[PDB]
Amino acid sequence: AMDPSSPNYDKWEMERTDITMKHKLGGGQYGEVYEGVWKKYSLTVAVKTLKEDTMEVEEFLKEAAVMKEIKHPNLVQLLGVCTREPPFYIITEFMTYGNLLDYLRECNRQEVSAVVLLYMATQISSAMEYLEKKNFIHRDLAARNCLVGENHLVKVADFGLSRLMTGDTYTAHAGAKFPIKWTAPESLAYNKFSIKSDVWAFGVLLWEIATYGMSPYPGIDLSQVYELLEKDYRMERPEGCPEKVYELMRACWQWNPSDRPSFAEIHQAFETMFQESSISDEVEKEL
Ligand X SMILES: Cc1ccc(NC(=O)c2ccc(CN3CCN(C)CC3)cc2)cc1Nc1nccc(-c2cccnc2)n1
Ligand Y SMILES: CCCCCCCCCCCCCC(=O)O
* Binder of residue 161, out of ligand X, ligand Y, Cl ion, none (CB less than 5 to 8 A by kind): none
Stretch of residues binding ligand Y (CB under 6 A), selected from 9-17, 24-32, 58-66, 114-122:
114-122
3-state secondary structure of 31: coil
- Dihedral sign (CA 191, 204, 78, 37): negative
Which uninterrupted H or E stretch holds 102? helix 100-106
Nearer to ligand X, 147 or 266 (CB): 147
Query: 183 or 211, CB closer to ligand Y?
Result: 211
Question: Residue 136 interacts with Cl ion (CB under 5 A)?
Answer: yes
Stretch that binds ligand Y, among 73-81, 95-103, 171-179, 204-212 (CB under 6 A): 204-212
Nearer to ligand Y, 64 or 148 (CB): 148
**Catalytic: 140?**
yes
Note the maximum CA span of the chain: 64
Q: Are 193 and 216 in contact (CB under 8 A)?
A: no
| The only residue of 37, 137, 164, 222 in contact with Cl ion, by rule CB under 5 A | 137
Do 140 and 271 form a contact (C-beta atoms < 8 A)?
A: no
Least separation in angstroms between CB 119 and ligand Y: 8
29 is in an annotated binding site: yes
Which residues in 133-156 are b (16+ Cβ under 10 Å) and which e?
eeebebebbbbbbbbbeeebbbbb
Alpha-carbon distance 142 to 180, whole Å? 11
Q: Note whether 106 binds ligand Y by CB under 6 A.
A: no
Query: Any residues with CB less than 8 A from the CB of 236 and at least 6 apart, and which?
Result: none
Give whichever of 98 and 240 is closer to ligand Y, judged by the CB atom: 240
Question: Please, what is the minimum distance in Å from the beta carbon of residue 248 to ligand Y?
Answer: 8
132 with 195: CB under 8 angstroms? yes
Q: d(Cα 155, Cα 96) in Å, to the nearest integer? A: 12
Distances (CA, A) of 207 to 129, 131, 227, 248, 256: 19, 21, 21, 10, 20
Centroid of chain to Cα 73: 14
Of 137 and 269, CB closest to Cl ion = 137
130 is in an annotated binding site: no
Residue 49 counted as an annotated binding residue: no
118 is a contact residue toward ligand Y (CB under 6 A)? yes
Which among 53, 140, 158, 232 is annotated as catalytic? 140
48 labelled binding-site residue: yes
Based on the shown chain and the rule CB under 6 A, indicate whether residue 114 belongs to the binding site for ligand Y: yes
Whole-number Å distance between alpha carbons of 241 and 207: 9
3 binds ligand Y (CB under 6 A): no
Provide the minimum distance between the beta carbon of 209 and ligand Y in the complex, in angstroms, as a whole number: 5
Q: How far is the CB of 262 from Cl ion (least distance, A)?
A: 16
Positions touching Cl ion (CB under 5 A) are: 136-137
Positions touching ligand Y (CB under 6 A) are: 114, 117-118, 121, 206, 209-210, 239-241, 245, 283
Annotated binding-site residue numbers for ATP: 25-33, 48, 93-99
Give the residue numbers marked as catalytic: 140
